[PDB]
Structure 1
Amino acid sequence: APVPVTKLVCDGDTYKCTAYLDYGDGKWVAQWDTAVFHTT
């Protein structure tokens, strides 16, 4: 089911975003790769 994302973070080291999901026992997440960089 499409459930809400309640919190989103991005890890500096691994270039993974992690979305915490509003469902069930609270331990579901979704993860995807990203490119992280400093802007000008």
Structure 2
Amino acid sequence: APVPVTKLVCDGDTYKCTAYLDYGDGKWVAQWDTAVFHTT
């Protein structure tokens, strides 16, 4: 299936972004490595 993403967050401690999914009981997420930094 194609599973819709509801919203995103990212964490500078873990260097993970997390997508909340519209699926099942509402507590599934998708997660991936990201860089995080203060820009200019």
| TM-score under structure 1 length normalisation | 0.90
Aligned length: 40
Structure 1 residues not aligned, in runs of 5+: none
* 4+ aligned runs moved over 3 Å, structure 1: none
CA distance in 1, matches of 2:26, 2:8: 14
How big is the alpha-carbon RMSD for the aligned residues of Structure 1 and Structure 2? 0.7
Gaps in structure 2 of 5+ consecutive residues: none
Identity of aligned residues (%): 100
TM-score for both structures, normalised by structure 2: 0.90
